[PDB]
């Protein structure tokens, strides 16, 4: 009964708790595990340098997914392995399930002598299977770009397991590449989706070499606080530089501009 009376309201945005959460992601970069299990293998060993991996985690968000394209080489006369040598961050905005990337792929002179190896994205919860939306994303990219081979491009999922960071890497099958581009259902249990659509690759973290990053030229990679500015047919150039953190100042100008008049 309001016969006594009520109270007043105070607003609390949700990114503030996640901003404090993202400030401590560096503690996870020291406990990064990879999956071994009994998953057979498939071919092509993918080596991921630790420096770009730890940098990719600290600029991440514990709930909103971020993604980065993979570009790499293999040693001179040893074509059986695949060394990831650079992660390209492009304008994007993500949710707790999928990531939204533009239709255009990274095009630059530095990556001219490298081949695409797929893409890597963070995941809030560790799933025993590759997400059905990840098949749809990977297969649709292959349908628009023939440079992405089915047996060469992979999907690395950096799942946020408490206090840790476990990495799982998969690759698509002909059954998966098919159904994936047919998929119009953004669901978690879509139809035609079967475990026959993907198979795990072998991934090995190492400190033998060091990778680099590529970020947009006159832009930034994080568009989560400006999704209206995002459009799937946007074009972008790239520069040779390291990306900024998720909650960097240039990623959320509205929080600073709107606070300038009260």
């Amino acid at each position: 009964p309001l016969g006594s009376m009520t109270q007043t309201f105070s607003s609390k945005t949700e990114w503030r708790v996640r901003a404090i959460s993202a400030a401590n992601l560096h503690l996870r970069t020291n406990h990064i595990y990879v999956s071994s299990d009994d998953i057979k293998e498939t071919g092509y060993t993918y080596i991921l340098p630790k420096n770009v991996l730890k940098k990719f985690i600290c600029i991440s968000d514990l709930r909103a997914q971020i993604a980065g394209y993979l570009y790499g080489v293999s040693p001179p006369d040893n074509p059986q392995v695949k060394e990831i040598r650079c992660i390209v961050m492009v304008p994007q905005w993500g949710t707790h399930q999928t990531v939204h990337l533009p239709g255009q792929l990274p095009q630059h002179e530095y990556l001219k002598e490298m081949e695409p190896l797929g893409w890597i994205h963070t995941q809030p919860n560790e799933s025993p299977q590759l997400s059905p939306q990840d098949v749809t994303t990977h297969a649709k990219i292959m349908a628009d770009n023939p440079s992405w081979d089915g047996e060469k491009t992979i999907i690395i999922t950096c799942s946020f397991t408490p206090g840790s960071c476990t990495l799982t890497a998969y690759k698509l099958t002909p059954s998966g590449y098919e159904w994936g581009r047919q998929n119009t259902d953004k669901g978690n249990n879509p139809k035609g989706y079967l475990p026959s659509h993907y198979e795990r690759v072998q991934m090995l973290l190492s400190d033998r070499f060091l990778g680099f990053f590529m970020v947009p030229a006159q832009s930034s990679w994080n568009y989560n606080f400006m999704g209206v500015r995002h459009d799937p047919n946007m074009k972008y150039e790239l520069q040779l530089a390291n990306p900024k953190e998720f909650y960097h100042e240039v990623h959320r100008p509205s929080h600073f501009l709107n606070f300038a008049l009260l």
Binding site: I20, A23, G211, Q218, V250, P253, F256, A260, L262
Partner: protein, 1725 residues
């Protein structure tokens, strides 16, 4: 020391601060009464009658003052009471003064009479002041008063021409704090933050007078700053012995005698106390004390008292009411107005048609300020710092003209402007202090200043000051204003922060130094006269009379608090203090010791922006800040909207400070009267707080955090976020146009690419186009080039080119613009290198070149990053990615030559008793290095290369090749080359005794003077020279017979080819290889160098077979070398030197307790400071004279021969020092005592490491960088200098090992480890010094075409490194025609530069030919830049004056320092020389040489370093004069050529053409020749004709001095000239005519020319000149050297027919008064 205690400092702290009342009782003057009234109490104190004039107390008029001081008192007629009693002690006395007087008595003029005596000491004759010689410090309490007194002092002394200015306050870069200024007016905190900074390149050395105004501030909480300032300056007098005068001005308060002792004031000389009777205007005091305690009832009661007292003066006297906020001033002014209309009490302020109410309403309209417009017509006004300044002077002007009756202002008016009023009311005495976080009574200074304005000087016969306060504080303000509030000490609260400041400054280094330092503090004097008051019982006072144990406990307590917070490292057993970088940050940035501990705890490289704002909020400067209940709601609205999240809750005060900082950046006006006050205090201190956090993490290499903190400094300074457009930083712009630009989401880096038309279309505002286009390019912007130069597979040198890409505007950018160069790694995580760049407006359009080294690992990283962030501008950054995908690394250096375990070779193998006598008694056998080469050097004739560490006995290996030359040909000639002239003389000293005093083979040392070097060549068998002295001679090899015939050529220390003057060393050896190639019988070449990584490149470049290549490495030194490299974290140079002072002593006792030690220091002044620092450290352990292994008196036949004061005191205890400022008299004596074992330690500077004939067992290299006075930046030690200093740690026949400790900065630690344990890689830099050598090879016709220039380059060491390291020379491939295209552009650009300067001729872009201009530059070894400028300035009417400002601008004189410690000493020498200058400003090295040359011509003896500065100026002046002689004569100019020929003999003998010709004779006085027109003597030949029987008298000399008068007269050249014209009749106009001139020297002379005041010994040069004087046209000229028989011919062609009378000149170049002149006629047909 033993039994100390830890005290509780805050238990001994006077918490009330300035409100602390030490007097327990208060007695008022007679006539004081007090009434009880409406719930309050009033206390009245009557006005004091002036004291009857004392005996001998008359008012002194200004006329009786010293005449030089009356200009500062222009406008005053008679000094008042206190000034006339002080004029003698201030103007005619240097005593420390302390003047006590009530505010308004006129104490400032007494300080002026102190400043006038100081300025009068430094005036000179010209009528000005040598303002480079002194500086005065005026310390005022409030910054508002500082501004006012700068203007008044600047006007009262404007007639002197003296700069008085407030401090810039925001410039550690380009700190023009002073220099231009001479009287600095500052606050106590401002002068202390300056003197806290180390590095005495500051101008505090010139401080002769310090004025401490309102020194009763000692009782205030800011008091400790005055104690720290005085204790620092006074204790500095005890170490410098330079007196500094301290003048204190105080108010009438007790304990003034203790203040006098604290200022070192003699109580019978400088103490002056004038009680309140001496107030010029009598003051009636009324104190109102409120007993009411309700919050707003007391507010109304105060509002009733303020009304009834204004009514007591309404209409009769003006009233000035003081309140303590810029908001209550308007509320109160309206309060005592609304109350009057409530009673119709306003016809009193303004009359019926008043003469003032008309202009009070006509200017209330033009006021345009709404708050003041309401009150102005009624006769009211307000005044505070928030309003405009035109309003304040408007309020001041109307109040000064008796127009406004009531003025309600704050305390700023009392300090800023001298605006007195008859009645002054202080409404309330309570103010909010954000530092204390509560409400506090007003300060004692503010009260005394506001009530000091009561009573106008002349209009009022008395003043009426009214004080309204709470009743419980009446006893305080009664004592403060009636000379009864004692001045106490408030220091113990700030003792830890003040102790650390002296620790960082190096003034205190142990507890004893702090106890002595504490003795100068005002706390100590108060703790002696009233120890009882300061928590010390009178029982314990006499159990410790001077309080030695009490001060020791206070120091021990403060040191433990400082050690716990990691600012100091306290060794409790020794009492020693160790400085830290963290401790230096707190002192230099004025941070309390508790805050930096919080910083050291929470600062992490992975820190967020969220946590960063939290680390700032936890600063202990906000310890008293709380969160009030009335503030929680308004703070809750912002906490839920701040852009940076806050983790803690609103209940904690750390959250509140975070919200106020973010709101201040967003420029949001808050509400709470304490909230906005707390926000101001938080942010006014956030600038220096965040600036400290920036320097902390920047020096730690944290890249991500450095970018965050530096941006927070700029976000706080610019009051904006990064999210906003960087165009709002331009204040000249409306705020709403940029807001429409920002919300239009497009980047700011775009607008650079678009015209001023599309800018208005994007922003949808074509209203103002070019305005934004103007401000876009006014924004700073820099473009970054780079050229990667790989030194090693591990080390990489980087050349960064900075090109400014913006238009400069002094209105926006100022005098300079600052930037930060940041070199980050792959992950943008570690700052591999950071240095500081500063772009000054003077070079705002030039490219800047920066060089640095960064490490590299072999798994070649993807790229590095170079960021250039602006220091002030937000969002102003340029990052250049430095990729390594195309970089070509050099190859791994080959393994060294294995040192064979050979059998030790004795001198038996020489098989020559005459040769064996040179070594058999120095040592029995050779070292393993000298034995391996012996077969190849002594028994072979092949070219040898021996690369061994410094100290491997390589000089003897060079003697092996020399001893072989004398056996195959006893008359053989060898030329030995060494890079340094200091090495050449000691090698000349060593090889003279061995080869000439024992083998009787003549050895010589080249002079650098071409008048004698060619002569020592022919007669000498061993020629010793440096690269420059040999390059000039071997340039003419194909015409000089004695150059191409030498049997041996030895180049020493050839690893210096990569040094500064390495190219010249590369040219000569490459030339010797080419000459031996272009001739029969090759010249043997032996190369000695330090162990090289690419040694076989040098062996290939010098034709050394692999069998003859001996490339050793530092691991085979004959005496083992134990090298230790200690890193030091302190980034401040002067503070880092302090941090390694004690380790210098600790390394001596650890590595060489009994054997000799050499310590290298960066500066000359450091030589003595370290030598003293070592000794007192030796005495601190009570081991005095431990380094004196000789008996105290066996040195006084050596000791008392020197001129220095401290050198003799330090040598007495066994420690000497060497520096360039010392004598040559002094150095050879200290060196002898060092090798004698008498002294164990010597402290030599870095300048003497090449010219030292002493070796030690232990060498300490204290720091590895020095300060360059020209660029005004620190320069790292060259690696070649470090290798030389380590080489001195070598004693073969004395020690089993050699030790060396290198103390360096932590950043340079890994650099020395890679270039001291491994061989040194050397490169060529000839490609940057190509012009001068190409021109020489063109004159000698070695290079006749462009193909020849490419062929000549293949003979160089530069050609072979282009394939081993292509990227070092900006090559991208080592392919065959990659070299040609790179070599061809090098010869194409070098030849075109010479062709532009008119030195060579290019024909069909293939053939080259030298011009006469180039033949002069190559003949006299002069830069082509110098000769080109010589041709444009030498005119037909040039004389001795125009010549000296042509030789001045030579490129060979741009290289010696400009010392602005001296500019006014040169400015007055510009008035000393006989020849004035045109437009002279004295920051150009070419103007200094002109004044220095005239100072030498006039025999003006000057400094000891500027005397030796001319020695290297005159070392090149002869060749510069002869070059002009060859240029003026080539153009057919007669008079300038002969004037230049006379300039040669003028420089040689230091005279003038006007001066007497008898000034050449030795031992003649100055004015000896006023003794000539008295006795008929003019020429030098007269003395030789004056009779010996009477020339014994007259000259008044010493036989000694007339034995040298002959030696000059004998060798004085007089020559009999014979001249004839061949075929006088057969002369056809247009045919040949020859004049034959024969010279017979009349004499028989020995030795060279006698000129003692000239460094180089010269030979007699002569010219024979033909010309027509009336036409000013030289016809013939010819150089010649006259032995005793020489004949000259002068051929020319005849002009038209007629008579044509010519002149026959015979000029000398080293003697004045011998130039003959023969006239003749030539009948032509």
């Amino acid at each position: 020391l033993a039994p100390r205690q830890v005290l509780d400092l805050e238990d001994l702290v006077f918490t009330q601060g300035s409100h602390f009342m030490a007097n327990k009782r208060c007695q008022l003057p007679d006539g004081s009464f007090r009434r009880q009234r409406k719930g309050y109490e009033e206390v009245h104190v009557p006005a004091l009658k002036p004291k009857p004039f004392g005996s001998e107390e008359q008012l002194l008029p200004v006329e009786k003052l010293p005449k030089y001081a009356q200009a500062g008192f222009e406008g005053f007629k008679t000094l008042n009471r206190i000034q006339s009693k002080l004029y003698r002690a201030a103007l005619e006395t240097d005593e420390n003064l302390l003047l006590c007087a009530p505010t308004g008595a006129g104490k400032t003029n007494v300080a002026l009479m102190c400043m006038l005596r100081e300025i009068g000491k430094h005036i000179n004759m010209d009528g000005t002041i040598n303002v480079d010689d002194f500086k005065i410090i005026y310390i005022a309490p409030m910054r508002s008063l500082v501004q006012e007194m700068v203007g008044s002092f600047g006007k009262r002394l404007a007639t002197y021409g003296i700069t008085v200015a407030e401090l810039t306050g925001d410039h550690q870069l380009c700190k023009e704090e002073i220099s231009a200024t001479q009287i600095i007016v500052c606050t106590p905190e401002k002068w202390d933050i300056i003197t806290r900074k180390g590095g005495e390149r500051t101008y505090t050395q010139l401080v002769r007078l310090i004025i401490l105004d309102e020194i009763h501030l000692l009782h205030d909480d800011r008091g400790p700053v005055l104690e720290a300032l005085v204790a620092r300056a006074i204790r500095n007098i005890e170490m410098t012995q330079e007196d500094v005068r301290l003048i204190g001005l105080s108010a009438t308060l007790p304990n003034y005698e203790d203040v006098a002792t604290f200022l070192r004031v003699d109580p019978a000389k400088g103490l002056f106390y004038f009680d309140n009777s001496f107030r010029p205007v009598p003051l009636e005091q009324t104190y109102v004390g409120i007993t009411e305690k309700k919050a707003i009832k007391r507010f109304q009661i105060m509002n009733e008292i303020v009304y009834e007292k204004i009514m007591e003066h309404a209409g009769k006297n003006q009233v000035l009411v003081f309140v303590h906020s810029r908001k209550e001033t308007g509320k109160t002014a309206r309060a005592i107005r609304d109350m009057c209309l409530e009673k119709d009490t306003l016809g009193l302020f303004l009359r019926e048609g008043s003469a003032s109410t008309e202009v009070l309403r006509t200017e209330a309209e033009q006021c345009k300020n709404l708050e003041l417009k309401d009150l102005l017509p009624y006769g009211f006004a307000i005044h505070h710092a928030g309003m405009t300044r035109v309003d304040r002077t408007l309020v001041e002007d109307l109040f000064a003209d008796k127009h406004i009756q009531v003025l309600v202002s704050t305390a700023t008016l009392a300090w800023g402007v001298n605006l007195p009023a008859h009645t002054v009311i202080i409404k309330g005495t309570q103010v909010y202090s954000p530092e204390k976080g509560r409400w506090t009574e007003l300060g004692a200074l503010d009260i005394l200043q506001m009530l000091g304005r009561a009573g106008r000087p002349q209009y009022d016969t008395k003043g009426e000051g009214i004080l309204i306060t709470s009743h419980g504080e009446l006893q305080y303000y009664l004592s403060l204003l009636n000379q009864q509030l004692p001045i106490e000490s408030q220091m113990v609260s700030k003792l830890p922060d003040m102790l650390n400041a002296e620790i960082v400054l190096g003034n205190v280094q142990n507890a004893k130094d702090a106890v002595n330092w504490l003795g100068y503090a005002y706390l100590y004097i108060r703790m002696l006269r009233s120890p009882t008051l300061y928590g010390i019982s009178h029982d314990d006072l006499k159990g410790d009379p001077l309080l030695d144990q009490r001060r020791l406990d206070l120091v021990h307590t403060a040191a433990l608090m400082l050690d716990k917070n990691n600012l100091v490292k306290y060794d409790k057993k020794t009492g020693n203090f160790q400085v830290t970088e963290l401790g230096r940050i707190a002192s230099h940035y004025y941070i309390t010791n508790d805050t930096v501990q919080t910083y050291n705890q929470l600062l992490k490289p992975t820190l967020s922006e969220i946590e960063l704002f939290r680390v700032f909020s936890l600063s202990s400067e906000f310890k008293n800040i709380t969160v009030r209940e009335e503030e929680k709601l308004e703070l809750q609205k912002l906490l839920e909207r701040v852009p940076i999240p806050v983790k803690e809750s609103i209940e904690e005060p750390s959250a509140k400070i975070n919200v106020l900082l973010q709101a201040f950046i967003s420029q949001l006006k808050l509400e709470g009267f304490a909230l906005m006050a707390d926000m101001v205090y938080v942010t006014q201190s956030a600038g220096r707080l965040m600036r400290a956090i920036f320097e902390i993490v920047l020096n730690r290499g944290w890249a991500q955090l450095t970018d965050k903190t530096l941006n927070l400094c700029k976000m706080i300074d610019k009051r904006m976020w990064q999210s906003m457009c960087p165009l709002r930083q331009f204040r000249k712009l409306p705020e709403e146009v940029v807001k429409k630009i920002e919300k239009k989401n497009f980047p700011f880096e775009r607008l650079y690419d678009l015209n001023h038309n599309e800018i208005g279309e994007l922003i949808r505002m074509p209203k103002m186009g070019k305005t934004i286009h103007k401000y876009v390019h006014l924004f700073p912007k820099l473009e970054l080039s780079v050229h990667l130069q790989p030194i090693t597979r591990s080390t990489l040198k980087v050349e960064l080119t900075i090109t400014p890409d913006f238009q400069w505007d002094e209105k926006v950018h100022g005098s300079s613009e600052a930037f930060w160069i940041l070199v980050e790694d792959v992950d943008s995580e570690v700052i591999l290198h950071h240095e500081y760049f500063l772009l000054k407006a003077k070079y705002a359009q030039d490219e800047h070149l920066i060089t640095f080294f960064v490490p590299v690992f072999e798994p070649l990283p993807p790229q590095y990053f170079i960021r250039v962030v602006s220091d002030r501008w937000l969002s102003c950054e340029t990052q250049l990615p430095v990729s390594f995908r195309h970089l070509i690394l050099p190859e791994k250096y080959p393994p060294p030559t294995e040192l064979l375990d050979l059998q030790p070779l004795p001198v038996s193998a020489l098989r020559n008793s005459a040769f064996e006598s040179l070594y058999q008694d120095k040592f029995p056998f050779f070292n393993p290095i000298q034995t391996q080469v012996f077969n190849t050097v002594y028994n072979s004739d092949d070219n040898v290369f021996v690369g061994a560490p410094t100290g491997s006995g390589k000089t003897i290996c060079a003697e092996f090749a020399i001893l072989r030359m004398l056996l195959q040909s006893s008359e053989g000639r060898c030329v030995y080359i060494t890079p340094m002239e200091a090495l050449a003389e000691q090698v000349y000293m060593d090889w003279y005794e061995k080869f000439q005093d024992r083998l009787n083979k003549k050895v010589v040392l080249l002079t650098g003077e071409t008048s004698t070097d060619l002569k020592l060549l022919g007669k000498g068998n061993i020629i010793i020279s440096t690269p420059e002295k040999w390059d000039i001679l071997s340039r003419r090899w194909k015409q000089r017979k004695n150059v191409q015939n030498i049997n041996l050529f030895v180049v020493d220390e050839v690893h210096l080819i990569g040094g500064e003057n390495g190219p010249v060393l590369e040219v000569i050896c490459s030339r010797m290889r080419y000459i031996s190639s272009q001739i029969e019988r090759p010249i043997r070449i032996v190369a000695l160098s330090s162990s090289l990584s690419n040694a076989k490149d040098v062996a290939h470049w010098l034709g050394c077979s692999a069998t003859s290549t001996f490339n050793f490495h530092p691991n085979v030194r004959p005496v083992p070398l134990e090298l230790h490299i200690q890193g030091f974290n302190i980034s401040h140079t002067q503070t880092r030197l302090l941090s390694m002072a004690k380790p210098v002593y600790h390394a001596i006792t650890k590595h060489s307790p009994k054997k000799p030690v050499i310590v290298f220091v960066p500066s000359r002044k450091q030589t003595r400071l370290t030598a003293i620092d070592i000794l007192t450290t030796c005495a601190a352990d009570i081991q005095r004279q431990r380094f004196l292994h000789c008996t105290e008196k066996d040195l006084i036949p050596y000791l008392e021969k020197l001129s220095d004061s401290t050198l003799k005191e330090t040598l007495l205890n066994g420690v000497g020092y060497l520096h360039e400022g010392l004598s040559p008299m002094e150095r050879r004596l200290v060196e002898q005592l060092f090798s004698s074992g008498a002294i164990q330690v010597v402290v030599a500077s870095r300048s003497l490491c090449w010219g030292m004939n002493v070796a030690a067992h232990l060498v300490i290299i204290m720091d590895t960088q020095y300060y360059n006075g020209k660029i005004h930046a620190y320069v790292d030690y060259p690696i070649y200098d470090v290798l030389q200093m380590v080489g001195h740690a070598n004693r073969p026949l004395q020690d089993d090992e050699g030790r060396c400790v290198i103390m360096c900065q932590g950043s340079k630690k890994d650099f020395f480890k890679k270039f001291l344990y491994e061989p040194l890689p050397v490169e060529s830099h000839l490609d940057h010094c190509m012009h001068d050598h190409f021109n020489a090879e063109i004159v000698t016709k070695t290079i006749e075409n462009k193909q020849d220039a490419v062929d000549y380059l293949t003979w160089t060491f530069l050609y072979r490194r282009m394939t081993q390291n292509p990227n070092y020379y900006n090559l991208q491939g080592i392919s065959h025609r990659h070299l040609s295209d790179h070599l061809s552009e090098l010869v194409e650009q070098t030849l075109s530069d010479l062709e532009q300067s008119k030195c060579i001729s290019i024909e069909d872009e293939m053939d080259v030919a030298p011009l006469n201009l180039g033949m002069i530059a190559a003949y006299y070894y002069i830069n082509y830049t110098t000769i080109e400028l010589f041709s444009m300035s030498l005119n037909a009417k040039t004389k001795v004056r125009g010549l000296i400002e042509i030789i001045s601008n030579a490129a060979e004189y741009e290289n010696i320092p400009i010392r602005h410690h001296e500019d006014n000493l040169l400015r007055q020498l510009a008035q000393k020389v006989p020849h004035k200058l045109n437009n002279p400003k004295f920051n150009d090295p070419h103007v200094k040489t002109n004044l220095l040359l005239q100072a030498h011509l006039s025999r003006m003896q000057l400094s000891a370093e500027l005397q030796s500065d001319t020695e290297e100026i005159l070392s090149k002046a002869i060749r510069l004069i002869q070059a002009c002689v060859d240029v003026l004569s080539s153009n057919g100019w007669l008079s300038p050529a002969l004037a230049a020929m006379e300039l040669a003999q003028m420089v040689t003998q230091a005279m003038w053409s006007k001066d007497s010709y008898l000034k050449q004779l030795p031992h003649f006085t100055s004015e000896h020749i006023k003794r000539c027109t008295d006795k008929g003597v003019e020429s030098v030949f007269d003395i030789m004709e004056m009779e010996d029987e009477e020339r014994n008298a007259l000259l008044q000399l010493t036989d000694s001095q007339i034995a040298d008068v002959a030696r000059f007269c004998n060798r004085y050249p007089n020559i009999e000239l014979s001249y004839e014209v061949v075929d006088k009749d057969s002369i056809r106009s247009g045919g040949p005519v020859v004049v034959l001139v024969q010279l017979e020297r009349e004499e028989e002379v020995t030795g060279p020319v006698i000129a003692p005041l000239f460094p180089q010994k010269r030979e007699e040069g002569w010219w024979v000149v033909i010309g027509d004087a009336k036409s000013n046209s030289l016809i013939s000229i010819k150089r010649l050297t006259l032995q005793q028989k020489a004949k000259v011919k002068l051929d020319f062609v005849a002009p038209a027919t007629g008579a044509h009378n010519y002149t026959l000149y015979f000029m000398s170049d080293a003697y004045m008064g011998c130039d003959q002149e023969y006239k003749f006629s030539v009948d032509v047909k």
